[PDB]
Write a protein that binds this ligand. Structure first.
Ligand code: NI
Length: 97
């Protein structure tokens, strides 16, 4: 159901961020056929996730609220991870509550 091997992802949000500030990355599926994109983010806080589909691709925004390591799993057209997933993002700053 589409080819996860043809999905690329890039941007600052894949590597890091700071608490209470939004991070962004882009997932490009344009040559990967038609399939469902899955993005999950797991770590020391539950993040809010937005995706806006632009010409350059799926623009994903999230805001981490605690410092530490977040795992960003990106799968396409089934259970398979795209190349580089799960990405580990390191977030710094105060734990916000
Ligand atoms: Ni999207």
């Amino acid at each position: 159901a589409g080819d996860p091997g043809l999905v690329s992802a890039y941007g600052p949000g894949l590597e890091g961020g700071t608490t209470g500030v939004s991070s962004e990355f882009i997932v490009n599926t344009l040559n990967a056929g038609s399939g469902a994109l899955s993005v999950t983010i797991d770590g020391p806080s539950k993040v809010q996730l937005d995706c806006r589909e632009c010409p350059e691709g799926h623009v994903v925004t999230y805001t981490p609220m605690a410092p530490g390591n977040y795992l960003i799993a990106i799968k396409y057209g089934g259970p398979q991870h795209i190349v580089g997933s799960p990405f580990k993002a390191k977030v710094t700053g105060p734990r916000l509550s």
